[PDB]
Structure formats: structure tokens, C-alpha cells
């Protein structure tokens, strides 16, 4: 959570950091506001499980339970209301870099940053987050297939390995990650309690 900036320094580094923070805030606000024989097939809906998962997430306090159950390990198994078992995964880190280093010093009168690599690191992280939020913005909330930004290679491999299926299916699907990525889906989900969560839908080959 970021609220406002008060320091009015002259050095260019402060100006760059303030501009990047403003871009971050604008992206967060935008994402907040975003909240032959062919006629014998059927019009059955494509994305339905993700809608149910998001609706369960929108219920009272489930996101708080998920956040409180993922404080020590980045990967765990959490159970929602009613009955369901869904994998949860945490990516990136913004609860330590921006809340412990930049916020306590910007909210002052005479801020000054005597370094240059922090700008590069902050711009890289903000570029990643802004790319994610822009790709959600352009496609009106539904994207297909999932780009490299939402799911990296290592994370996808870990998710496939942790998927509760047999061994032959894992062997067949881990060698053709392009195809399984092509047929997946992504749904942008509830925003609240300073935590952003969305749903990724991966196919489960059966035959």
C-alpha cells in the first residue's frame, strides 16, 4: 500500500523514483478499476471452473485465510469453503523492498537517494508488474494463451510436477509445454486487502 508522496527534492534520482512510483500507483489504480458438418457441436461454455474458483475467492475472508497460510513457505496447499483443493503460488516480492526501504524515507521533507542501481532494480520490477497489468487491460480481463509474464518456465514446471496426476501424463505434458500453454486460460480475480490474486486454468489430458 502506497498513499502519497511529500518530499520535494531537487536531485534527478528523486525525480526518477517519484515518476516510477507514480507509474506504479497508476497501474494499481487501473487494475483496481478493471475489477463441413460444423453445426453439430454445441455452444457449451469454455471458462466455467475459473469463474467458480473466483466466486469462492470473493466470499467472506477466504483470501485472508489464504494470505495467513502462506507466510513462511511460498508454495502450499490451501482449502477454501465448502470443499475444494486448489494449489496456490506466490510470485515476486513487494512487501519488503518498497515498504522498508523507500516508503520510510520518501515520506519526509528532504529525501535524497545516493545510489543508482536502485533505480534500475525498481524500474525492472515495475516494468514486470506494469506489463502484467497492461496485458490484462488490453484483453478486457481474459487472456489466451498465457504469456511468459503470468507464468515463467520454472513455475510452470513446478506446477506440472505438483499436479495430482499419474506419471505418464506428466511425462507427456512436460515435454510439450508449448501445447499445454496454448490451451490454457487466465482470469483476473478479486482485489482487496493489499493482496492481488488471479486464477490460471491448465488443461488436464485424459486420453
Amino acid at each position: 500500500n502506497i498513499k502519497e508522496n511529500k518530499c520535494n527534492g531537487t536531485d534527478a534520482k528523486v525525480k526518477l523514483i517519484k515518476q516510477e512510483l507514480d507509474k506504479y500507483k497508476n497501474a494499481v489504480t487501473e487494475l483496481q478499476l478493471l475489477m463441413f458438418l460444423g453445426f453439430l457441436l454445441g455452444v457449451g461454455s469454455a471458462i466455467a471452473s475459473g469463474v467458480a474458483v473466483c466466486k469462492v475467492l470473493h466470499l467472506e475472508g477466504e483470501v485472508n485465510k489464504i494470505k495467513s497460510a502462506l507466510l513462511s513457505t511460498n508454495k502450499a496447499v490451501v482449502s477454501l469453503s465448502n470443499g475444494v483443493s486448489v494449489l496456490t503460488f506466490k510470485v515476486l516480492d513487494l512487501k519488503n523492498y518498497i515498504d522498508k526501504q523507500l516508503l520510510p524515507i520518501l515520506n519526509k521533507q528532504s529525501c535524497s537517494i545516493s545510489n543508482i542501481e536502485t533505480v534500475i532494480e525498481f524500474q525492472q520490477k515495475n516494468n514486470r508488474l506494469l506489463e502484467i497489468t497492461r496485458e490484462f487491460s488490453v484483453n478486457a480481463g481474459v487472456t489466451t494463451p498465457v504469456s511468459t509474464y503470468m507464468l515463467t518456465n520454472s513455475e510452470l514446471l513446478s506446477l506440472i510436477n505438483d499436479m495430482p496426476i499419474t506419471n505418464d501424463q506428466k511425462k507427456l505434458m512436460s515435454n510439450n509445454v508449448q501445447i499445454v500453454r496454448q490451451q490454457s486460460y487466465s482470469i483476473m480475480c478479486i482485489i482487496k486487502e493489499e493482496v492481488l490474486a488471479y486464477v490460471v486454468q491448465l488443461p488436464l489430458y485424459g486420453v
Epitope: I105, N107, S112
Partner: antibody
Framework: QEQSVQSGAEVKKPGASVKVSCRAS????????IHWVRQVPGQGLEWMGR????????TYAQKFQGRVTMTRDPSTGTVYIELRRLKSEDTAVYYC?????????????????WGQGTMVTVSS | DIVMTQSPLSLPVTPGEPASISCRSS???????????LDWYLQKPGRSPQLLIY???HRASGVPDRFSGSGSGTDFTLRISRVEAEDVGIYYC?????????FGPGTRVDLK
């Protein structure tokens, strides 16, 4: 950066007690310390003491130990300082200042605001 | 406590030439994690003191781009890039490491 926030001038007599009040709600900036600085005309500055507005922890100097008392009134967030037995030589000017500084891995923040200052004199 | 000295105790200045004032300290003022804890204060005749330099070699709001600080350890220098006719007054040297805070005697700067 004078903010023009203090009490008025004070004229007293030896053997009595003097009271100086500074209100810390018009500094326009949040502060973590309210250090008091005294200055006798014709000389330099000299530290007097400090109190934390959050709780009221007091820290004085060795020379002024056992004579000055600082208190905080949370009705308007004001600080009061009491001096006892002004055995002359205390004719000076008192300032209440906001003084905070924080350091991190990359970047330092500071906030320093001085006050208008009051004049306290003792005479027969 | 900690005892401070300044040099010189009198320094007339010309409107267009630079100037430098040195603060010399007792046992090192250098903190741990980083950065010094010394400050340079300015005072015009009659008004209230205004901060000039904080934490060694940084600048606060205002203070147009002709004041600078330098030094590491026990000696520090305040340098004026190009003085003007509005810098007459008294300069003070302050510490922030322990809390027997002790201002310096004060250097007087007047127009020549």
C-alpha cells in the same frame, strides 16, 4: 523556515519558577522529537533537552538535571517546560524545534523545523 | 561529552569568490551502518536559525545550489561555490551521535 508558533515574552524575578509552552500541532509536518534549544544573546547555541511526543520519555543534560521538568498535554498536543529557581543568568531565548532523521540501505530522510522563539528574562 | 572546534573564527568574504569553513571534532562521529551525523546550521541576525547541511553532504529543501559539504571521519568542510551578498551571519556545527548535544562556538561571516 520560521513558523511563528510560540508564546509571548516573559519577565520574572529571582527565586520563582518560569513556564514556557510550545504547541506542536501547527508545524505542518509530523515530528518524532521536539528538542528544546536555549540561547543567551551574544553567545552560541546550547542543548537543553528533549521529550518524545509519542509517550513522554524525557532526556536532559547533566547541568540542567534535577531542575527542569517537561510535560505533554494531549488536549492539543502541546509541550510545557518548567524551570525552577532562576538564579539569574537565565535571560535568554528558547526555541522548540521539530527534529527527525531516518536512514535506510539507500536513502536518508530528514525533517528540521525551527520555531519563532520566546524571550525569558529575570530582573529585580 | 564531545568538544568541537571551528576554523577560522573570522572570515570576511567577497561577492564572487568561494569560501570554506572547517569543523574539527573529538573521537570519531562516524556511526555504524553508514553515514556521518554532523550538520551545518545558518543564522541571520535577528531571525531564527535555518538548516543548511544535514548528514554530511546532503541538502534539504531550499538552500540554492551553491552550498556543499565534504569530509569523512573527524574533519568536515563546508564550501560555498559562489557566495552572494545575502550570506552574512553566523554558522554553527552540530552533532547527532550521542545525546550530550553540543553546538560549536560559531563562525562569523561578513561582507568585505
Amino acid at each position: 523556515q520560521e513558523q511563528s508558533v510560540q508564546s509571548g515574552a516573559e519577565v520574572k524575578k529571582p527565586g520563582a519558577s518560569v513556564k514556557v509552552s510550545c504547541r506542536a500541532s501547527e508545524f505542518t509536518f509530523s515530528s518524532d522529537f521536539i528538542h528544546w534549544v536555549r540561547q543567551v544573546p551574544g553567545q552560541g547555541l546550547e542543548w537543553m533537552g528533549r521529550i518524545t511526543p509519542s509517550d513522554g520519555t524525557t532526556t536532559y543534560a547533566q547541568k540542567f538535571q534535577g531542575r527542569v521538568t517537561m510535560t505533554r498535554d494531549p488536549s492539543t498536543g502541546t509541550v510545557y517546560i518548567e524551570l525552577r529557581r532562576l538564579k539569574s543568568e537565565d535571560t535568554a531565548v528558547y526555541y522548540c524545534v521539530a527534529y527527525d532523521r531516518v536512514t535506510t540501505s539507500a536513502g536518508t530522510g530528514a525533517t528540521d523545523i525551527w520555531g519563532q522563539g520566546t524571550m525569558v528574562t529575570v530582573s529585580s | 561529552d564531545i568538544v568541537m572546534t571551528q576554523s577560522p573564527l573570522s572570515l570576511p568574504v567577497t561577492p564572487g569568490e568561494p569560501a570554506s569553513i572547517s569543523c574539527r571534532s573529538s573521537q570519531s562521529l562516524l556511526h555504524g551502518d553508514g553515514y556521518n551525523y554532523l550538520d551545518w546550521y545558518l543564522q541571520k541576525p535577528g531571525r531564527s536559525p535555518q538548516l543548511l547541511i544535514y548528514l554530511g553532504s546532503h541538502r534539504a529543501s531550499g538552500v540554492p545550489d551553491r552550498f556543499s559539504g565534504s569530509g569523512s571521519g573527524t574533519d568536515f568542510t563546508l564550501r560555498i561555490s559562489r557566495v552572494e551578498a545575502e550570506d552574512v551571519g553566523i554558522y554553527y556545527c552540530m552533532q547527532g551521535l550521542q545525546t550530550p548535544f553540543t553546538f560549536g562556538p560559531g563562525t562569523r561571516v561578513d561582507l568585505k
